[PDB]
Design a protein around this motif. Structure first.
Motif, short mmCIF file in Angstrom:
data_model
loop_
_atom_site.label_atom_id
_atom_site.label_comp_id
_atom_site.label_asym_id
_atom_site.label_seq_id
_atom_site.Cartn_x
_atom_site.Cartn_y
_atom_site.Cartn_z
N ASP B 160 0.82 -1.21 0.00
CA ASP B 160 0.00 0.00 0.00
C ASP B 160 0.86 1.27 0.00
O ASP B 160 0.43 2.30 -0.49
CB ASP B 160 -1.01 0.00 1.17
CG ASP B 160 -0.35 0.09 2.53
OD1 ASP B 160 0.54 -0.73 2.82
OD2 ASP B 160 -0.73 0.98 3.33
N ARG B 161 2.07 1.18 0.54
CA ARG B 161 2.98 2.32 0.57
C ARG B 161 3.83 2.42 -0.70
O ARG B 161 4.34 3.50 -1.01
CB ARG B 161 3.83 2.32 1.83
CG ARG B 161 2.99 2.55 3.08
CD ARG B 161 3.85 2.67 4.33
NE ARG B 161 3.00 2.79 5.52
CZ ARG B 161 3.43 2.73 6.78
NH1 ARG B 161 4.72 2.54 7.05
NH2 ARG B 161 2.55 2.86 7.77
N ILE B 162 3.97 1.34 -1.45
CA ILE B 162 4.52 1.44 -2.81
C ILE B 162 3.55 2.25 -3.66
O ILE B 162 3.96 3.05 -4.49
CB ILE B 162 4.75 0.05 -3.45
CG1 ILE B 162 5.82 -0.72 -2.68
CG2 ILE B 162 5.20 0.20 -4.90
CD1 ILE B 162 5.91 -2.19 -3.04
N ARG B 163 2.25 2.05 -3.42
CA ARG B 163 1.21 2.79 -4.14
C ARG B 163 1.07 4.23 -3.64
O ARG B 163 1.08 5.16 -4.44
CB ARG B 163 -0.13 2.07 -3.99
CG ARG B 163 -1.29 2.69 -4.76
CD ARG B 163 -2.60 2.00 -4.43
NE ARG B 163 -3.03 2.30 -3.06
CZ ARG B 163 -3.09 1.44 -2.04
NH1 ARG B 163 -2.78 0.15 -2.18
NH2 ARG B 163 -3.49 1.87 -0.84
N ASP B 164 0.94 4.39 -2.33
CA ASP B 164 0.56 5.67 -1.72
C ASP B 164 1.77 6.54 -1.31
O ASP B 164 1.63 7.75 -1.13
CB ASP B 164 -0.32 5.44 -0.48
CG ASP B 164 -1.68 4.82 -0.82
OD1 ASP B 164 -2.12 4.91 -1.99
OD2 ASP B 164 -2.31 4.24 0.09
N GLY B 165 2.93 5.92 -1.13
CA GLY B 165 4.12 6.62 -0.70
C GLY B 165 4.44 6.47 0.78
O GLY B 165 3.59 6.09 1.59
N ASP B 275 10.61 17.84 -6.90
CA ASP B 275 9.31 17.50 -7.50
C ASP B 275 8.87 16.13 -7.03
O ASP B 275 7.70 15.89 -6.77
CB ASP B 275 9.39 17.51 -9.02
CG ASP B 275 9.57 18.89 -9.59
OD1 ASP B 275 9.13 19.88 -8.96
OD2 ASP B 275 10.15 19.00 -10.70
N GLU B 276 9.84 15.22 -6.95
CA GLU B 276 9.57 13.85 -6.55
C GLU B 276 10.78 13.33 -5.78
O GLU B 276 11.90 13.78 -6.00
CB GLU B 276 9.32 12.93 -7.75
CG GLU B 276 8.53 13.55 -8.92
CD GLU B 276 8.15 12.52 -9.98
OE1 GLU B 276 8.17 11.31 -9.68
OE2 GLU B 276 7.82 12.93 -11.12
N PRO B 288 7.75 5.46 -3.56
CA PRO B 288 7.77 6.91 -3.40
C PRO B 288 7.97 7.36 -1.97
O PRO B 288 7.50 6.71 -1.04
CB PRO B 288 6.36 7.34 -3.86
CG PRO B 288 5.70 6.12 -4.37
CD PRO B 288 6.37 4.96 -3.70
N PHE B 289 8.68 8.48 -1.82
CA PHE B 289 8.70 9.24 -0.57
C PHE B 289 7.87 10.49 -0.78
O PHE B 289 8.27 11.36 -1.55
CB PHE B 289 10.13 9.61 -0.20
CG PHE B 289 10.92 8.49 0.40
CD1 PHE B 289 10.50 7.88 1.57
CD2 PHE B 289 12.12 8.07 -0.17
CE1 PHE B 289 11.23 6.86 2.16
CE2 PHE B 289 12.86 7.04 0.40
CZ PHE B 289 12.42 6.45 1.58
N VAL B 290 6.72 10.58 -0.11
CA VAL B 290 5.77 11.68 -0.37
C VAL B 290 5.88 12.85 0.61
O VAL B 290 5.26 13.89 0.40
CB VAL B 290 4.30 11.18 -0.41
CG1 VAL B 290 4.06 10.35 -1.66
CG2 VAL B 290 3.91 10.39 0.83
N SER B 291 6.65 12.67 1.68
CA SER B 291 6.91 13.76 2.60
C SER B 291 8.26 13.54 3.25
O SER B 291 8.79 12.43 3.25
CB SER B 291 5.84 13.84 3.68
OG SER B 291 5.87 12.69 4.51
N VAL B 301 1.63 13.40 -3.13
CA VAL B 301 1.27 12.12 -3.75
C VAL B 301 2.41 11.70 -4.67
O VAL B 301 3.20 12.54 -5.11
CB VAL B 301 -0.06 12.17 -4.53
CG1 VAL B 301 -1.23 12.40 -3.57
CG2 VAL B 301 -0.03 13.24 -5.62
N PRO B 302 2.50 10.39 -4.97
CA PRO B 302 3.59 9.91 -5.82
C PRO B 302 3.58 10.59 -7.19
O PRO B 302 2.51 10.75 -7.79
CB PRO B 302 3.31 8.41 -5.93
CG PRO B 302 2.59 8.09 -4.67
CD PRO B 302 1.71 9.28 -4.40
#
Ligand SMILES: *Cc1c(COP(=O)(O)O)cnc(C)c1O
Ligand SMILES: *Cc1c(COP(=O)(O)O)cnc(C)c1O
Lengths: 329, 329
Positions: B160-165, B275-276, B288-291, B301-302
């Motif tokens: 879920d964190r691969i998806r959501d970050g 940006d990412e 993703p790292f989202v924060s 978001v990713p």
């Protein structure tokens, strides 16, 4: 591995030094643990069978602390201090030992008794351990382990160099790992820096390394502390150095002999200009450093205070109420 | 230890992600090595019996290097690159492997075959080893060992964190160990700094740590590399960071997608203004790292390039001539 019969185990030496004398005894060849053994997961086992799980985090992430105490003439030396330090070090790493200090001492002394060794090197390590599954990644799920081994007393420096002195080198290819990465006041197996220092010692043709800290001040050696004496004042690095139990003893001895003995920051200039320099560690005791980088320390022979400290250290190994704990053979 | 029957071993998951799909198969319960095993001193053994000598210097002084490669849908991923790096790392430590690269690959692939695992985490470590006697101190007398284990694929980050970050934290209680103590470009088990970073992550309520180097620049995480994207330029720390094989793949992917991809020094300001941001490692792939420190990266978001890289990474795990080596089950 380690297939030597009891008769082939070397457990005594003629030291050539009047103040270091091994016990006069024979190992029992009918005892499979005679001359060396380990305590692993509740079993006392010979060294050939002394094995830990490859999944122990003490291996996979060097997530472990330890201490080494020694036994001399059938008495453990400063065992209480050692186990106190081990447990403090575990707490620093947030490892909760699965045994109490008293339980650890009980097992360690029984282990030495089973080996029959009157002069011994005894390692006690405490790891983060392992979980119910071999590939577990959550550091909080592992259950900690205590591992011990007792083998013949080990000498970092040879007898002739305890007498004549050791030729030191200031390492310049490495610095002692900073506290802000790995705390050098917590005894650990993460020797990457210390081993590079030993490799540099070989590369440059010297006998032992002295490392510096991130500020360029004297730190410690590859498994030993360094002590510097100038105008009767005995000093040893307080910062980038394990709080050695040998060091503790050395400073106590220095004070009993009437010398000011303190932990302090020591510059490279002060090291080179010292009256005397010595090294100390459980695995070998105390010895002189008579040169640094090929520059003699004073007159290039072991100094009077060093010799007094070495003799007194070895006296305390034979006669001391407070410092000695007898093994129940 | 590790007493779970074949039926109790978890070796597949429903990922909920269309680009990550495990193989559809059953382990053979009549095979004692099914679902996980080790290769130690010439023997293939189940995890319950996978044990190394307590006297191995890989334990006692963390005198060891390693790599982890993975198997996905029955193919090892970038095995040649992994064993090349392992051997380069051994050479950096002056450890002479007792097997050739080809011999290591042969044994590793056979080990995976015996486990029957189509998706696997495979550790290969090479230690300084041990000597003829258990208490030997001369680092030059030890004879080196190769140890391997293959277990179910491990995920540093959940699906879920691969998806959501993932919500990252810049560690301030530690810095990555300096090259002048322990070289971070040589893969090692000396995780004292990385573990303190993980402990700080827990203390401060975040999900993953990002460490800084001695100059205050971005380094890497606890077993993973970090990648920063700004205006279509993909960058990753060149200095205080393992040269990750996932990182290598990520930068190759970035270039194939038309983006400039380089190793570089990245400031904390540049990390926060990116940006990412993403993370990558063999044990989990790319996410993703989202924060960072509770500050959103861009819109929290990713980002598009990250998602393209993640999808492409997992595509290369299923279809790639050059990158995949089949296990001979
Ligand atoms: C063990 C050790 C010492 C010496 O400590 P003692 O308690 O005297 O044995 C010094 N430095 C390092 C790095 C050590 O690991
Ligand atoms: C293994 C590792 C990585 C990632 O390397 P891969 O080759 O991609 O698995 C990153 N950082 C550290 C500290 C590692 O040990």
């Amino acid at each position: 591995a380690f297939s030597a019969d009891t008769s082939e185990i070397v457990y005594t030496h003629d030291t050539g030094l009047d103040y270091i004398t091994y016990s006069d005894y024979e190992l029992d060849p009918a005892n499979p643990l005679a001359g060396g053994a380990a305590w692993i997961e509740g079993a006392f086992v010979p060294p050939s069978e002394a094995r830990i799980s490859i999944f122990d985090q003490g291996y996979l992430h060097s997530d472990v602390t330890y201490t080494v105490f020694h036994v001399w003439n059938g008495n453990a030396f400063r065992l209480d201090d050692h186990i106190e330090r081990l447990f403090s070090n575990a707490e620093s790493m947030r490892i909760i030992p699965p045994l109490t200090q008293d339980e650890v001492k009980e097992i360690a002394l029984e282990l030495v008794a089973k080996t029959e060794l009157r002069e011994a090197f005894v390692s006690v390590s405490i790891t983060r351990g392992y979980s119910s599954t071999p590939g577990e990644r959550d550091i909080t799920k592992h259950r900690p382990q205590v591992y011990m081994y007792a083998v013949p007393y080990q000498w970092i420096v040879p007898f002739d160099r305890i007498r004549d002195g050791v030729h030191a080198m200031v390492a310049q290819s490495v610095r002692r790992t900073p506290r802000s990465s790995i705390d050098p006041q917590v005894k650990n197996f993460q020797w990457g820096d210390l081993i590079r220092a030993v490799q540099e010692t070989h590369d440059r043709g010297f006998e032992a390394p002295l490392l510096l800290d991130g500020d360029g001040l004297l730190a410690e050696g590859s498994g030993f502390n360094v002590v510097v004496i100038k105008d009767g004042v005995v000093r040893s690095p307080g910062r980038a150095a394990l709080p050695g139990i040998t060091r503790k003893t050395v400073l106590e001895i220095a004070e009993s002999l009437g010398h000011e003995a303190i932990l302090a920051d020591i510059t490279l200039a002060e090291l080179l200009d010292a009256d005397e320099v010595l090294g100390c560690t459980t695995a070998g005791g105390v010895w002189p450093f008579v040169s640094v980088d090929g520059n003699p320390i004073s007159d290039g022979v072991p100094g009077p205070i060093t010799q007094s400290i070495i003799r007194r250290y070895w006296e305390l190994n034979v006669e001391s109420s407070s410092l000695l704990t007898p093994v129940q053979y």
